[PDB]
């Protein structure tokens, strides 16, 4: 998470796919962003200290592989939000908070 003046880096445990004996619980990208940064939940949106870090209020950056995974899983999903993909063990999500926002 890059708020602009300070950066916060986190690792969140994700499950390995081709494995029956990997019982690491499943969470979405929104729940993982909420946990990793202890963000507050205002009704429906996700707030950092005093900044909105929801999917719309920030610019999301990924590498090629994470973007491809997120896209091909947005196809097979309804209610299409990036914060609903399921955090597949090797993602490189980079939230960037904008300078000015309305």
Partner 1 sequence: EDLDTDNDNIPDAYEKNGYTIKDSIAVKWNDSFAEQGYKKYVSSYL
Residues near partner 1 (CB under 8 A): 18-21
Under DSSP, the state recorded for 29 is H
Nearer Cβ to partner 1, position 80 or 89?
89
Q: Give the residues across from 3 on adjacent strands.
A: none
Closest contact distance (angstroms) between CB of 26 and partner 1 is: 16
- How far CA 86 is from CA of 22, 70, 83, 96, in Å, comes to 15, 9, 8, 20
Nearer Cβ to partner 1, position 54 or 86?
86
Closest contact distance (angstroms) between CB of 68 and partner 1 is: 23
Closest contact distance (angstroms) between CB of 14 and partner 1 is: 17
């Amino acid at each position: 998470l890059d708020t602009g003046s300070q950066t916060f880096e986190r690792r969140v445990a994700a499950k390995e796919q081709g494995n029956p004996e990997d019982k690491t619980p499943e969470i979405t990208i929104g729940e993982a962003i909420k946990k990793a940064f202890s963000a507050t939940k205002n009704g429906e949106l996700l707030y950092f200290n005093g900044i909105p870090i929801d999917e719309s209020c920030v610019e999301l950056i990924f590498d090629d592989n994470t973007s491809e995974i997120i896209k091909e899983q947005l196809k097979y999903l309804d209610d299409k939000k990036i914060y609903n993909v399921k955090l597949e063990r090797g993602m490189n999500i980079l939230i960037k908070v904008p300078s000015y926002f309305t």
